[PDB]
Design a protein around this nucleic acid. Structure first.
Ligand SMILES: [Zn+2]
Lengths: 127, 60, 117, 98, 24, 78, 155
RNA sequence: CGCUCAAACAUUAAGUGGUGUUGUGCCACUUC
RNA sequence: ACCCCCGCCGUUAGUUGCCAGCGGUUCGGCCGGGCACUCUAACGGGACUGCCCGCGAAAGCGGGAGGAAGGAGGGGACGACGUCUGGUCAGCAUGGCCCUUACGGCCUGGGCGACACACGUGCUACAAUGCCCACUACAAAGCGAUGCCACCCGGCAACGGGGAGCUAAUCGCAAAAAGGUGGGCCCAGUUCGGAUUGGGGUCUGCAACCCGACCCCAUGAAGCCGGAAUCGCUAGUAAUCGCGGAUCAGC
């Protein structure tokens, strides 16, 4: 009946509860498009659903938390992917290749000392 | 005004305003950690010395 | 319309028009429109004859501004000059009066740069 | 019905006493929750490495503090005594309330 | 601007709240 | 800038409150350039210190809410 | 880069047009990471397209950048001290860096107030050619033509 | 815009000169 | 390389979270309830050019699959024999040298903040990718018992009074900001830019003249993107937006 996966991204983790139904997509309450009002990066989240044609056949109650706004949508990508690959192991052959099951470890690297921004040495001089 | 200076921070005969932190070991007035009671210089030594409880080299 | 006796704010936001008045800014402009209940939107070219009179009778009679205000500012300084204090000696020479920088910067009351060296 | 807080600077010795607690307690009366690994405070004091005008290449340490929790529903008359003559910490901190 | 002493975009820089920033 | 109890030092009020008793002179050595000019110390001539010496300066009616240090420069070049 | 050829960086397709050229120029209008602005600006421009000209936005966008697309640039080569300006080919991955950029310039040169309409009306003149962004292409191309003299250093 | 000058400044580890550019009237040689 | 953080998974834990599961609901993870997940923080697993092929004498290299992660996965800790007769004897140590009603000690105050000027480093901008204002939303790592101060009242506000809880994953600094939506301004030295200055005012502290921080009215400057030259960055980097901490009565 249910589907589930666990996707993270920059402190912003997200659960994924999948249940057969309409196209309802509630994330921690909040209507889908509503919680991303005026955000073009939104529509990228529901990508692993048109790669399976099961966008108008699957609801999904998400539970994301942490990080900023735009980074969250990346923790919903990894999640929706792991959820429709669990109860469906065969969708993995054509899912992983297109790139959907990767942590993506691109994280803001620690700021160094002797720098303002890790990779930002004080405007050099010599005068 | 080095020796006598240290014995001045133990008295506080006047206003609390004139009170300041003093390095226990050395005698510096600048860079005294309110946690250790030491100055930035030596607490580093006594940090190479492991004579500081818990204090350990850090890396992340 | 001439409101500050000689100052004539026209053809723009009535609220912001009072800004160009010497002694009136962005805080007193929201005050005179609410004590006379005037529209902070419509321009100056279009308001009641009794409204130009309304804000002219009120504003120019509510406090000091225009030139009689600048008048006092000079005096207040001329009192720091006469006896000669420190908060006076800084007008008297033209340097900053907040113990600020003088070894560098302070060109606001030091004029243009002079070089010479 | 009884709570205990274990604070320490060395989680190695802290975790050994945290586990030492369960053995005696459980195996003598009361249902006892295992070692609860609570969040970790860390006092990182960065310092200038050199002794003079060398504001850079400096060095910084940290004072980690490990906090663990354990609970014990029934304070068995058999465990209250089982937790006084078997408790031998060292550089560890413990607290007991009701 | 951030260098203003009388704006929302200023008080968010100078730490203070004052009249131009929400409070009790 | 202070508001409750206009600050000062008691010594100076000490040596001047006796000057209001029988109105003698107006001369006195001072060291409290910090203190606030008393509206009641009008007409005296106090000698205020500035690290160098004492400056005899006359007090009037206009200058009150200020301090003695204001009328006693510390930068040789004024 | 002295070690490896440094393989080109692949960016993700558009979220409304699904094209690696669109977003390639989007982040180009992008300032300080505010990817939203340039994106909205971009689409509000394509809405101007469907109002001015009955044509499809991405069409006038494909033809626009192609027009301001340098065929042969002018570069500098060192042949024993002397420093010429030897003209030659424009790497197929440079034509795309430049063109997308060279529209950015003239759209920021336009008198128009709103940013959307400066990239909209500009991309409506790049597909035409008469635009003041193509006038940054026609120019660099002339520099190559006139320099076709010192061509025997084409390496 | 071009042309001459005495400085502030910039190029060099430094010096020197040059020069760059503003201001003004209309890479070379050397480091006891 | 042996160490730490971050990437994937599992063990151990359930005062952190969860109508996922059901029941009650002031329908708020608030009560019961549960360890699943999230997380928290310890223990391990994993990646060895191991597999495939191609190139090669080997080492090694290039390509592909598996995989969370390939060829050192990203990041840190770690800097040789010596060089700079570099730096510091003013952190301390310490040979030599000089002073000793004094080159030592006290205090108040001044000064280290002085300005005809020059360099380094900086922040804010000179605006429509913006300025303003209202509502609305999302972090990490941290720090806090005469410190963090929930909420109520006054006040334009800085703030003060009243007063709850909290030695803290339980209370608090806590609004994160840019974002989103609606509104105004309409290219102007401006509702850009907030330098300077007058007046009033709050708090720390014996005391803010020299010299503090901040609030309000007002005043609102140079400034229309910067010469020669010169500066940083190979990716979650630059840039851009915020937040906290050490130092501290305050700054
Ligand atoms: Zn020390």
């Amino acid at each position: 009946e249910q589907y589930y996966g666990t996707g993270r991204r920059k402190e912003a983790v997200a659960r994924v509860f999948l249940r057969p139904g309409n196209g309802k997509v509630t994330v921690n309450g909040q209507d889908f498009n509503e919680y991303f009002q005026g955000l073009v990066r939104a529509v990228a989240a529901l990508e692993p659903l048109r790669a399976v044609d099961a966008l108008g056949r699957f609801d999904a109650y998400i539970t994301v938390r942490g990080g900023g706004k735009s980074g969250q949508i990346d923790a919903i990508k990894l999640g929706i992917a792991r959820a429709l690959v669990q109860y469906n192991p065969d969708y993995r052959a054509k899912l992983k290749p297109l790139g959907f099951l990767t942590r993506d470890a691109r994280v803001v690297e620690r700021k160094k000392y002797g720098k303002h921004k890790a990779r930002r040495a004080p405007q050099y001089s010599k005068r | 005004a080095r020796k006598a200076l240290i014995e001045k921070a133990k008295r506080t005969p006047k206003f609390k305003v004139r009170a300041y932190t003093r390095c226990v070991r050395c005698g510096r007035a600048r860079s005294v950690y309110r946690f250790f009671g030491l100055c930035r210089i030596c607490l580093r030594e006594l940090a190479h010395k492991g004579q500081l409880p818990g204090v350990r080299k850090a890396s992340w | 319309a001439r409101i500050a006796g000689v100052e004539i704010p026209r053809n723009k936001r009535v609220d912001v028009a009072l800004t160009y008045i010497y002694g009136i800014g962005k805080a007193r402009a929201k005050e005179a429109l609410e004590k006379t209940g005037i529209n902070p939107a419509t321009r100056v070219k279009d308001l009641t004859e009794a409204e130009v009179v309304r804000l002219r009778e009120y504003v120019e009679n509510t406090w000091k501004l225009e030139g009689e205000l600048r008048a006092e500012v000079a005096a207040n300084i001329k009192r720091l000059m006469d006896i000669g204090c420190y908060r006076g000696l800084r007008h008297r020479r033209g340097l900053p009066v907040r113990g600020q920088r003088t070894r560098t910067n302070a060109r606001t009351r030091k004029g243009p740069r002079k070089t010479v060296a | 019905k009884i709570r205990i807080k274990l604070r320490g600077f060395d989680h190695k010795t802290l975790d050994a006493s945290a586990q030492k607690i369960v053995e005696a307690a459980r195996r003598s009366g009361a249902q006892v929750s295992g070692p609860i690994p609570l969040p970790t405070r860390v006092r990182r004091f960065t310092v200038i490495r050199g002794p003079f005008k060398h504001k850079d290449s400096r060095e910084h340490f940290e004072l980690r503090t490990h906090n663990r929790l354990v609970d014990i529903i029934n304070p068995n008359r058999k465990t209250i005594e089982q937790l006084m003559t078997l408790d031998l910490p060292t550089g560890v901190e413990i607290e007991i309330k009701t | 601007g951030k260098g203003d002493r009388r704006t929302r975009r200023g008080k968010i820089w100078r730490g203070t709240y004052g009249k131009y920033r929400p409070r009790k | 800038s202070l508001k409750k109890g206009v600050f000062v030092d008691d010594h100076l009020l000490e040596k001047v409150l006796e000057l209001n008793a029988k109105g003698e002179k107006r001369l006195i050595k001072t060291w409290s350039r910090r203190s606030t000019i008393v509206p009641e110390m009008v007409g005296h001539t106090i000698a205020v210190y500035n690290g160098k010496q004492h400056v005899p300066v006359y007090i009037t009616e206009n200058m009150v809410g200020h301090k003695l240090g204001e009328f006693a420069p510390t930068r040789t070049y004024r | 880069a002295r070690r490896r050829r440094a393989e080109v960086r692949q960016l993700q397709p558009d979220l409304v047009y699904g094209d690696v050229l669109v977003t390639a120029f989007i982040n180009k209008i992008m300032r300080d990471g505010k990817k939203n602005l340039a994106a909205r600006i971009f689409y509000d421009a394509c809405k101007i397209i469907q109002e001015k000209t009955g044509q499809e936005p991405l069409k006038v966008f494909k033809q626009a950048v192609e027009n301001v697309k340098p065929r042969m640039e002018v570069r500098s080569r060192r042949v024993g001290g002397a420093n010429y300006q030897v003209p030659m080919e424009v790497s197929p991955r440079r034509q795309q860096s430049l063109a997308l950029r060279w529209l950015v310039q003239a759209a920021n040169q336009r008198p128009e107030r709103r940013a959307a309409v400066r990239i909209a009306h500009e991309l409506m003149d790049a597909a035409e050619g008469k635009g003041g962004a193509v006038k940054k292409k026609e120019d660099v191309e002339r520099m190559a033509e006139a320099n076709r003299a010192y061509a025997h250093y084409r390496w």
